[PDB]
Structure formats: C-alpha cells, structure tokens
C-alpha cells in the first residue's frame, strides 16, 4: 500500500486493456533504513472502466502470493485518490514482442529456445500451484537482461480476466484466447495457458508478427469454427510444439513438464 506522495509519474509507455502505462519513480525506505528512489512501472486503470477494478488487482495479487525468479515483482498498489495503480518493478528492456521486431536480424534458435524454456519453467511452476495466468503472450514476457550468459525473462501479470471481459475484446485476442473460452469464457482452465503458450512460441518464432492480424474479428471467429491452425513460421523449428500446444481438445494439450522435455530435445 504505497502513498500517492511517494510516487512520481513520468513518461507514458502506452496502454494495456483498460489500463494506462507509465514509467515512474518511487521514494522508499529500503533495507538498513537507507533511502531509495526506485524506477517503477505504473499501471493505471482508466476511470472510465472502474467496473473492472477488482478483477485486475485480484489478478496481480493472486500471482504475487507466489515468488519465483521468472514471475514479475509487484511492489504494491496505490489507492491514489480517484485511481487504482499497480506499482511494479521496471524491467530494463521491456516487452518481448517489441524486442523481437527491433532485434529480429540478431535472434537465433538458441536464443529462442532459452526464452521458451524459461517461459515453460514459469508456466510449470504455475501449473504445479494450480494457478491460471490467462493472458500468456509475447507482450507479457519481460526481458530482464540481454544475451551476451543467456537472456533472462519474467512473465508479467495477466491483467483483467477474460472471464469478465467484453466478448469483442475476447474475439480480438484470438488466437491467444483458446477456442473453448470463445465458446464460454467461464471455460477458463489450466489447459487455457497451454494453448496461449503455443501462440506465444509462434510470436517468438515470427520476429514479433501477430498471428491472424490480417483477419478482422468475424474472420477470427470463423478461423476457430473451421478448426484451422496457425501457419508454420519460416523458422519452423518449434512448429510441431506450437501445433501440439494449440490443440482444439483442451484435455489433449501436453503438461508443461512434457513441453519442457520436448524443448530440451
Ligand atoms: N514491468 C514492465 N517493465 C517495462 N519496462 C520497459 C518499458 C519500455 C521500455 S522502452 N522500449 O520504451 O525503452 C523499456 C522498459 N515495461 C513493461 O511493459 C508492460 C509489459 C506488459 C504489459 N501488459 C499490459 C501492460 C503492460 C506493460 N512492464
């Protein structure tokens, strides 16, 4: 529970779903009582979307009860007057999808494999704790350090749950959102994240391209209706795993233990 008076808002860094994102600085008493001014990532719920307040912070809170080296650190929340604000560690190099596009001509299968193994390790930990993320995607992978020593990533918070989001938002998040959740958002399950994990591998192999971006929301719907799969990326080293993960039968998608074994071979 951070004080409004200890937070300084600086540059806007874009927007998430019903949120506004800013780089900031938090003034804090740290260990040994030393005074720190710490770079922070601030996520602000739109006042115009206050109805979704509980769900977002419930999301960030539930995961913050679990500490893990591949899960992002949340410092707390500010009840900052009229706005609710998540205060999060500032990750030096930002979101993976932006990174993949700018650095495409420098990323090889060895780099992709380490990032995939790290993400699966995070997902395996969640799976062992029966905790559903619900929004696995390249935008929500944060790059802590660049390869020199491998790269190092963290999974960000999931944001507002698909189980309360407007249907048109869900449709635009095809193919991250699995077919059974389009049929019924209340079908959100552990198997949901295996599908989205497959979609995120496709992103990682596709230099930051967004699958099915050329398809409007009605065509995305008919894509699931006809049981299509994503095309193999030109770099197709992960295409079989992508397709095995994006299985239209939720009960057939592999455990992350099996996925990690597949990545290791
Ligand atoms: N923890 C964290 N740290 C950063 N750091 C950062 C941002 C921008 C730059 S840059 N290229 O301008 O120099 C550098 C570093 N950025 C984010 O962005 C996210 C990630 C996922 C998100 N899902 C919904 C909103 C959202 C926001 N999260």
UniProtKB/Swiss-Prot annotation:
Tissue specificity note: Ubiquitously expressed throughout most tissues.
Domain spans labelled Protein kinase: 7-265
Post-translational modification: Autophosphorylated, leading to regulate its activity. Also phosphorylated by TEC. Phosphorylated on tyrosine residues in response to interferon gamma signaling. Phosphorylated on tyrosine residues in response to a signaling cascade that is activated by increased cellular retinol. Undergoes Notch-induced ubiquitination and subsequent proteasomal degradation which is mediated by ASB1 or ASB2, the substrate-recognition components of probable ECS E3 ubiquitin-protein ligase complexes.
Highest rank taxon of the organism: Eukaryota
Modified residue annotations for Phosphotyrosine: 32
Subcellular location: Endomembrane system; Cytoplasm; Nucleus
Site annotation Breakpoint for translocation to form PCM1-JAK2 fusion protein: residues: 168-169
Domain notes: Possesses 2 protein kinase domains. The second one probably contains the catalytic domain, while the presence of slight differences suggest a different role for protein kinase 1.
UniProt disease link: Chromosomal aberrations involving JAK2 are found in both chronic and acute forms of eosinophilic, lymphoblastic and myeloid leukemia. Translocation t(8;9)(p22;p24) with PCM1 links the protein kinase domain of JAK2 to the major portion of PCM1. Translocation t(9;12)(p24;p13) with ETV6. Budd-Chiari syndrome: A syndrome caused by obstruction of hepatic venous outflow involving either the hepatic veins or the terminal segment of the inferior vena cava. Obstructions are generally caused by thrombosis and lead to hepatic congestion and ischemic necrosis. Clinical manifestations observed in the majority of patients include hepatomegaly, right upper quadrant pain and abdominal ascites.
Family in the record: Belongs to the protein kinase superfamily. Tyr protein kinase family. JAK subfamily.
Complex and partners: Interacts with EPOR, LYN, SIRPA, SH2B1 and TEC. Interacts with IL23R. Interacts with SKB1. Interacts with STAM2. Interacts with IFNGR2 (via intracellular domain). Interacts with LEPR (Isoform B). Interacts with HSP90AB1; promotes functional activation in a heat shock-dependent manner. Interacts with STRA6. Interacts with RHEX; this interaction occurs in a erythropoietin (EPO)-dependent manner. Interacts with ASB2; the interaction targets JAK2 for Notch-induced proteasomal degradation. Interacts with MPL/TPOR.
Purpose of the protein: Non-receptor tyrosine kinase involved in various processes such as cell growth, development, differentiation or histone modifications. Mediates essential signaling events in both innate and adaptive immunity. In the cytoplasm, plays a pivotal role in signal transduction via its association with type I receptors such as growth hormone (GHR), prolactin (PRLR), leptin (LEPR), erythropoietin (EPOR), thrombopoietin receptor (MPL/TPOR); or type II receptors including IFN-alpha, IFN-beta, IFN-gamma and multiple interleukins.
The name this protein goes by in its record: Tyrosine-protein kinase JAK2
Organismal lineage: Eukaryota, Metazoa, Chordata, Craniata, Vertebrata
Gene: JAK2
């Amino acid at each position: 529970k951070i004080r409004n008076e200890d937070l300084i808002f600086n540059e806007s860094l874009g927007q998430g779903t019903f949120t506004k994102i800013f780089k900031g600085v938090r003034r804090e008493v740290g260990d040994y009582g030393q005074l720190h001014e710490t770079e922070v990532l601030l996520k602000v719920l739109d006042k115009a979307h206050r109805n979704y307040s509980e769900s977002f912070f419930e999301a960030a809170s539930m995961m913050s009860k679990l500490s893990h080296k591949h899960l992002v650190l949340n410092y707390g929340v500010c009840v900052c007057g009229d706005e609710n604000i998540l205060v999060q560690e500032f990750v030096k190099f930002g979101s993976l999808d932006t990174y993949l596009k700018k650095n495409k001509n420098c990323i090889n299968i060895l780099w992709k494999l380490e990032v995939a193994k790290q993400l699966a390790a995070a997902m395996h930990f969640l799976e062992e704790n029966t905790l559903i993320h619900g929004n696995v995607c390249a935008k929500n992978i944060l790059l802590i350090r660049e390869e020199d020593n491998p790269p190092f990533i963290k999974l960000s918070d999931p944001g507002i749950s698909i189980t309360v989001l407007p249907k048109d938002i869900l449709q635009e998040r095809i193919p991250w959102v699995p077919p059974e959740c389009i049929e019924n958002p209340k079908n959100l399950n552990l198997a949901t994240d295996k599908w989205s994990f497959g979609t995120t591998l496709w992103e990682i192999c596709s230099g930051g391209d967004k699958p099915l971006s050329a398809l409007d929301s009605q065509r995305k719907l008919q894509f699931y209706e006809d049981r299509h799969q994503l095309p193999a990326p030109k770099a197709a080293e992960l295409a079989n795993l992508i397709n095995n993960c994006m299985d239209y039968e939720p009960d057939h998608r592999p455990s992350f233990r099996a996925i990690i074994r597949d990545l290791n071979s």
